[PDB]
Amino acid sequence: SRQAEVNIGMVGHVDHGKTTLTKALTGVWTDSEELRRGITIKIGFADAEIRRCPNCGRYSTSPVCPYCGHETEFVRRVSFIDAPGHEALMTTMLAGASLMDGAILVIAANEPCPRPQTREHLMALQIIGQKNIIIAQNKIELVDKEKALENYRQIKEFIEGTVAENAPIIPISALHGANIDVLVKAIEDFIPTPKRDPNKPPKMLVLRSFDVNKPGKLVGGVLDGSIVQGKLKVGDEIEIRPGVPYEEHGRIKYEPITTEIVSLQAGGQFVEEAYPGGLVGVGTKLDPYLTKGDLMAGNVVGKPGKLPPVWDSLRLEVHLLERVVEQELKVEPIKRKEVLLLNVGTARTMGLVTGLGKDEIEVKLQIPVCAEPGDRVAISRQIGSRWRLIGYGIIKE
Ligand SMILES: Nc1nc2c(ncn2[C@@H]2O[C@H](COP(=O)(O)OP(=O)(O)NP(=O)(O)O)[C@@H](O)[C@H]2O)c(=O)[nH]1
Ligand SMILES: [Mg+2]
Ligand SMILES: [Zn+2]
């Protein structure tokens, strides 16, 4: 029960310090681990153990207090989430809000607030309703007291009326590890572990799938992912949707598959039960041939008879983005016949617009997806030679 309890998204404009701050909190100064990153949504996890020193009472993420040297006491393990680049981060938030429990918005003190990407990240948090926010006013050592206060006022102006209006603004130097203890304390006070109902039907979004048996006992396929509801236990019988692809009359169909959990890895150790928070590795009895090479990435795991429906096509209530991040801002209306890229949970599929409606579109999916009515779907359009997020859609019945 010491695995990560909450996922904290790291957001903020490019180079404002997200990665440096993550490293300051996790204690990583070497190293790669990029091999476990998602491939649909490029999400990565970095765990840290929050501890409190009995002597000076200050918080840190190390077994030994950085301030007095005394041994600290375990408080809680958390996981910090990231994605490579602005677009990947925006897509992650819009498609996988269920994967975040809070966020640290990193704002550089030596640049006017808010920068373009800073505005869009807050916009995404606003859209998904994520209010457990902490603001890290980074690179504070690079500015004088006057400019630091001015930057502070700009941040206050910026967050007023938003989901971050009640967020603490913590001046720090992620690079030099200055005032980090105050930030760690803020994580405890502003991003508390939610009161989750461990008895709701389990649901895990698969991020990756492998065959962990050496090149060449032969162990079953492994599924790595995020539990977003309920819990998983060794011995549990589980169903995976959409499932295994097969051909019928020259077309591709998917068959949900059932298996059993043999092992569970979470927080760097094998456990008998896993929960929301951090990455969870699920050992199954599945033939490794079915999980090898991420064949099940994007699938959903649950208990038999308690999984969301599978869709071959989606009816979406569409909400186009009011973006500010090279011209090409004005988002052109979605047209019938257009092929868009959709991200829902950890699933990714191209979609053909087959019909238009009032603030709604009908899309035929290249690959079926497992999702619930009401779930949010990130919508991207290929502009030139790359995919750009243009909005999001809500699955309708
Ligand atoms: N002087 C100073 N430089 C800092 C501080 N924090 C980060 N930097 C520097 O700012 C640069 C970018 O930091 P980085 O953590 O990579 O930023 P990021 O937000 O993760 N970048 P990206 O959005 O591209 O992933 C690096 O050169 C880093 O060392 C700080 O407190 N002081
Ligand atoms: Mg970074
Ligand atoms: Zn101490």
Curated annotation (Swiss-Prot):
Annotated region described as G4, given as residue ranges: 138-141
Entries under Pfam families matching the protein: eIF2_C, GTP_EFTU, GTP_EFTU_D2
GO function terms (MF aspect): GTP binding; GTPase activity; metal ion binding; translation elongation factor activity; translation initiation factor activity; tRNA binding
Residues reported to bind Mg(2+) 1: 19, 40
Group of enzyme by EC: hydrolase
GO CC, any one term: cytosol
Residues binding Mg(2+) 2, per UniProt: 15, 38
Sequence segments annotated as region (G1): 12-19
Cofactor(s) listed in the protein's UniProt record: Mg(2+)
Keywords assigned by UniProt, alphabetized: GTP-binding, Hydrolase, Initiation factor, Magnesium, Metal-binding, Nucleotide-binding, Protein biosynthesis, Zinc
GO terms under biological process: formation of translation preinitiation complex
EC code: 3.6.5.3
Catalytic activity, reaction form: GTP + H2O = GDP + phosphate + H(+)
Amino-acid positions noted as binding Zn(2+) in the UniProt annotation, renumbered to this chain: 53, 56, 65, 68
Region ranges (G3): 82-85
Xref: InterPro entries: EFTu-like_2, eIF2G, eIF2g_C, eIF2g_dom_2, eIF2g_GTP-bd, P-loop_NTPase, Small_GTP-bd, T_Tr_GTP-bd_dom
Chain sites annotated for binding GTP: 15-20, 138-141, 173-175
Region (G2): 38-42
Subunit structure: Heterotrimer composed of an alpha, a beta and a gamma chain.
Protein name from the UniProt record: Translation initiation factor 2 subunit gamma
